[PDB]
Design a protein around this ligand. Structure first.
Ligand code: HEM
Ligand code: HEM
Ligand SMILES: Cc1cc(N)nc(C[C@@H]2CNC[C@@H]2OCCNCC(F)(F)c2ccc(F)cc2)c1
Ligand SMILES: Cc1cc(N)nc(C[C@@H]2CNC[C@@H]2OCCNCC(F)(F)c2ccc(F)cc2)c1
Ligand SMILES: C[C@H](O)[C@H](O)[C@H]1CNc2nc(N)[nH]c(=O)c2N1
Ligand SMILES: C[C@H](O)[C@H](O)[C@H]1CNc2nc(N)[nH]c(=O)c2N1
Ligand SMILES: [Zn+2]
Lengths: 411, 407
């Protein structure tokens, strides 16, 4: 069956046939839509079909579907599963899989880039120290002195789920949060709980507004260990505004490298529980969410205070006014320092072109509208007007619960 | 089956039970989500009638009583004999208020129960429709102190005698396409405007020409009526800081009045049921003024502000967007015409959600529509999870009549 999507600004109509390869469930039914819900040990039995399915896709992609090379590999994976209860991906399959998990990430507006991804194979890793070294190399390679390059590092897969590799940090680079006795927070309020564990684990906290957290790393199901990323590896940008000279005196900065470390990569039925990836920022992630969420740095009042805005009625749109200037500043600062960044206009336009190309080549592009639309100026970006179909393809990236709720402490 | 919704900013978690009384289908399956798609007999009628009267009698604390069982019989007999039935005034008022209560796409529902219902089921001609609508417009406008209202024309019968308002809103501006190649006025209404001219309208060919009503009574060919100019309250648009703003020549109308929708109460279809409240500023300032396919005035405003338009990363569109919206709000307030800003409206709606959760067991809500088209994440609705489902009585969208009329 065919499904259509309309763009209401252009009347372009696209046809989705790809949704027919979708296995996993959405959380939605014919009676309820859960499109805005943030969150809506394997057997031999269930593994070979998922392996088979994936290898069929891989072999099609490289135009060898049905070849002797394809059949032999099905055979070989077959045997490995019956004998060992799992299997190992060839390099070429890991690369392809990691790329396709990004291609299939419906919440990611950055996917025009999906085919340029540096895959770092770290399946030979055995210790947290080893993980640390692999992660440092990732950071240095991705950062590339401000000319950011997309990369992912893939640590060994789940075996019995008693031996998981996990990166406890939600991103490789993030600032500490310190809840004070008066109830105010110092630094990033999102990271308070994680900061507390780091400190409990022996970290000596500087206790300022922008202290880069230590990595907390779990290898082979062991208790995790602290490591400080070398500071010369952590590229940071001080935030200033092109016209407002007082902006720098707010004392803001942000890190250049967005690097998601808490997700689970699934390929051919195997689960990679530590697979930190990175690209570059869209300016709104920092300027809207990180700086302006009430539960984050929450700088709207102080910025509007300094801009002498009428702050006595919401209808002066003082919040909206300060929001734009902060986002101007973020982009200005990154650009002035030659750190890769993309504005939300450019990102969404690029994404619409990617989406259209995907419909032509692939028969679809799963997209989560709730996430794709930027969190400022929604309707002046072309994605606002774009109907999207959301569905789940594998390979995929999935959220996993924070590991401190699940970890069996060895002591 | 007991579903939770989380606010990610306040950590408030609410439990939804109301969705289990959901009746209609969303267009989502367990395989595909269609959350962002704009458009996803006597035997059939009696269960629909019963389900409604059951909720009605429960709402008046009279469920399963003498009066309840009696009405159910009477309606059953009327259906069996006549193939439809008629609502009591009380049922109609309740039906209408609830349709708005159930509108998951509507941010303003904190107001749902203050709805003035105008019963126009005794209407029989287009001229009568025009009279009823003028009266609605004047009552709702109220010299700027806007009051919510709906006017309900006769229900569908065999479907060949439908009442319809051909306009999508009671008050909208004309759109004309020029030899130039571009568009004069509102480009969303080009098609409607040509039909008007085609049926006889003497268009002034300006930028802001209030369209005539095209009213169809009892399935007949529709007819043109100009709304009395003195009944259409308009607002000239100025900026509190920018002198030059006024000279853009911008105005908007004070009364948002949706007139193309279909009201379903207890299985009965009211295909002409124009309703109105008051505007959230973003509807005009963001959508009407700034959509590429609408008046699209970002490019011209950015220029007057002397901003750097060379590159998208200067955020000139965004800068101009805010000031445009400051201007819409300032003007309406200065002219004493009811308007709400998106901060205030979304805050109220979170209050509304919590009342509905604790009082009703939920509140169906479509996040894609509730979050404003500017500054999403600084309004509290962005961070609020919502469950979208279809409750009845309801408003449903209907195809433009000119697609589906026998001329
Ligand atoms: C290259 C530049 C990239 C840009 C500009 C970009 C942009 C974004 C944005 C704005 C989001 C929304 C989520 C949020 O706002 O926190 C997102 C989500 C996501 N991206 Fe991308 N992204 C990029 C690269 C990548 C890469 C390299 C990968 C993986 C290989 C990736 C995978 C994902 C996934 C899995 C999500 C969902 C995240 C979650 O569920 O928390 N992205 N992206
Ligand atoms: C009183 C102030 C009101 C406010 C501030 C308000 C606000 C809104 C907004 C912002 C939307 C989004 C639709 C769009 O962007 O075009 C909407 C949709 C809607 N509203 Fe409300 N509204 C109000 C009154 C009413 C009333 C009186 C009714 C019915 C009696 C109603 C029923 C609906 C319906 C059915 C929709 C969806 C319309 C569609 O599908 O196109 N609203 N409203
Ligand atoms: C509950 C929950 C579920 C889920 N899937 N995810 C979360 C992380 C949230 C998403 N929103 C805020 C926070 O995630 C913040 C980090 N997100 C960065 C990114 F994914 F957008 C990204 C990745 C790579 C790039 F190169 C550029 C950007 C929470
Ligand atoms: C295709 C389609 C489907 C659908 N359901 N609807 C449409 C009208 C579009 C939707 N979105 C913008 C435009 O409709 C503009 C009119 N909307 C006004 C309102 F509904 F928001 C409203 C009603 C009463 C008030 F007091 C205040 C506001 C098109
Ligand atoms: C409740 C709602 O789904 C939630 O706040 C979402 C909305 N859209 C988002 N979009 C992005 N890119 N990132 C987010 O964290 C969110 N949060
Ligand atoms: C495709 C998408 O659903 C469409 O552009 C929607 C998005 N959200 C909206 N939200 C509101 N309030 N009104 C609209 O017209 C739209 N349009
Ligand atoms: Zn859905």
């Amino acid at each position: 069956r065919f499904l259509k999507v309309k763009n209401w600004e252009t009347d372009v109509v696209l046809t989705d046939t790809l949704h027919l390869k979708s296995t996993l469930e959405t959380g939605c039914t014919e009676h309820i839509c859960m499109g805005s819900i943030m969150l809506p040990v394997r057997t031999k039995d269930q593994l070979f079909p998922l392996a088979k399915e994936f290898l069929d896709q891989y072999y099609s992609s490289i135009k060898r579907f049905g070849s002797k090379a394809h059949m032999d590999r099905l055979e070989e994976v077959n045997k490995e599963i019956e004998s060992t209860s799992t299997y190992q991906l060839k390099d070429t399959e890991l690369i392809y899989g990691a790329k396709h998990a990004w291609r299939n990430a419906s919440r990611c507006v950055g996917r025009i880039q999906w085919s340029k991804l540096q895959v770092f194979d770290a399946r030979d890793c055995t210790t947290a120290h080893g993980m640390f070294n692999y992660i440092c190399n990732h950071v240095k390679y991705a950062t590339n002195k401000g000319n950011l390059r997309s990369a992912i590092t893939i640590f060994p897969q789940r075996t019995d789920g008693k031996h998981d590799f996990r990166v406890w940090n939600s991103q490789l680079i993030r600032y500490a949060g310190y809840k004070q006795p008066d109830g105010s927070t110092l630094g990033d309020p999102a990271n308070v709980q994680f900061t507390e564990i780091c400190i409990q684990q022996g970290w000596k906290a500087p206790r300022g507004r922008f202290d880069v957290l230590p990595l907390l790393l779990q290898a082979n199901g062991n208790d995790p260990e602290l490591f400080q990323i070398p500071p010369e590896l952590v590229l940071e940008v001080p935030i200033r505004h092109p016209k407002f000279d007082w902006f720098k005196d707010l004392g803001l900065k942000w890190y250049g490298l967005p690097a998601v470390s808490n997700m689970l990569l699934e390929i051919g039925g195997l689960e990679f529980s530590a697979c930190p990836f990175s690209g570059w920022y869209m300016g709104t992630e920092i300027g809207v969410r990180d700086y302006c969420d009430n539960s984050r740095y929450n700088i709207l009042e102080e910025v509007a205070k300094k801009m002498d805005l009428d702050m006595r009625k919401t209808s002066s749109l003082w919040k909206d006014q300060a929001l734009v200037e902060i986002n101007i500043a973020v982009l200005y600062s990154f650009q002035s320092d030659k750190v890769t960044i993309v504005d939300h206009h450019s990102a969404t336009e690029s994404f619409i072109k990617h989406m259209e190309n995907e419909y032509r080549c692939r028969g679809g592009c799963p997209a989560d509208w709730v996430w794709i639309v930027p969190p400022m100026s929604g309707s002046i970006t072309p994605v606002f007007h774009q109907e999207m179909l959301n569905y789940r393809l594998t390979p995929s990236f999935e959220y996993q619960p924070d590991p401190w709720n699940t970890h069996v402490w060895k002591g």
